[PDB]
């Protein structure tokens, strides 16, 4: 989901996620 | 509380058979005997635009992402994870997944060289160490480290648990909220004193000599990442994949 740095980790936020 | 010791490290060892394709038991068949050997240019050049030396590092950042990305399907498997601040998540992630990397490598190493291209290969300890500077020094130091981790002959039930234990370092910087995150830990490392009592009677400070790796892989992680900006400056030519510079980036 969000998170404070998202915009700085979105490739790894799209695997988390 | 045994059972619920033994419970979760099942759980672990099924998610980490789910999670990751060349295990330990993969490799070790392989290496103990067929691979295709890279040991020079011309053979390289069959094992297979850019300079050598770049085009293997380049290859090795391929196997790195795909690396993070199982560790982070494992990571969603570990009891409690996903129900950290989201921020937390995101910070043991990007400080645990290379220290998990080198672990996992050192099950595809020998002291003679490393398993490529999901086993179908063998690329040698000597060629990795005979690349131009500063390309030379990029694998040797992950050779001197698996050596030794090697010497304590674990196996992946053991390795599951370890690499849970690494993922859920409260120590890491930035952590909002590290008490719950140190909750989770301590369940693992009973989890993994209990695993190794077990699978291990011949070594009763196995336990020990496992955990004082962590500072070992550390050591590793920093010198790399040293290494990385050296390159970065003079490289024009190197091009660091974008999931790689997320984790980088402030590390």
């Known amino acids: ?17 | 509380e045994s059972a619920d010791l033994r419970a979760l490290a099942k759980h672990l060892y099924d998610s980490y058979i789910k999670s990751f394709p060349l295990t330990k038991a993969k490799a070790r068949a392989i290496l103990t005997g067929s691979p295709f050997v890279i040991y020079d240019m011309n053979s390289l050049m069959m094992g297979e635009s850019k300079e050598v030396a770049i085009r293997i590092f380049q290859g090795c950042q391929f196997r790195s992402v795909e690396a993070v990305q199982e560790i982070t399907e494992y990571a969603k498997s570990i009891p409690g994870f996903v129900n950290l601040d989201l921020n937390d998540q995101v910070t043991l992630l990007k400080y645990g997944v290379h220290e998990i990397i080198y672990t996992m490598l050192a099950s595809l190493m020998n002291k003679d060289g490393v398993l490529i291209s999901e086993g179908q290969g063998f690329m040698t300890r000597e060629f990795l160490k005979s690349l131009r500077k500063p390309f030379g020094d990029f694998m040797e130091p992950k050779f001197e480290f698996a050596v030794k981790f090697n010497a304590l002959e674990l196996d992946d039930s053991d390795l599951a648990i370890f690499i849970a234990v690494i993922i859920l370092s409260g120590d890491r910087p930035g952590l909002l909220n590290v008490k719950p995150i140190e909750d989770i830990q301590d369940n693992l490392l009973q989890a993994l004193e209990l695993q190794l009592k077990l699978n291990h009677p011949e070594s009763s400070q196995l336990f020990a000599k496992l955990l004082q790796k962590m500072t070992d892989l550390r050591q590793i992680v920093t010198e790399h990442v040293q290494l990385l900006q050296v390159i970065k400056k003079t490289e024009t030519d190197m091009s660091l994949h974008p999931l790689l510079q997320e984790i980088y980036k402030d590390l």
Request: aromatic share 0%; hydrophobic share 40%; charged share 25%.
């Open chain 1, 1 to 17: 989901x969000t998170h404070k740095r998202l915009x700085s980790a979105x490739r790894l936020t799209x695997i988390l996620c």
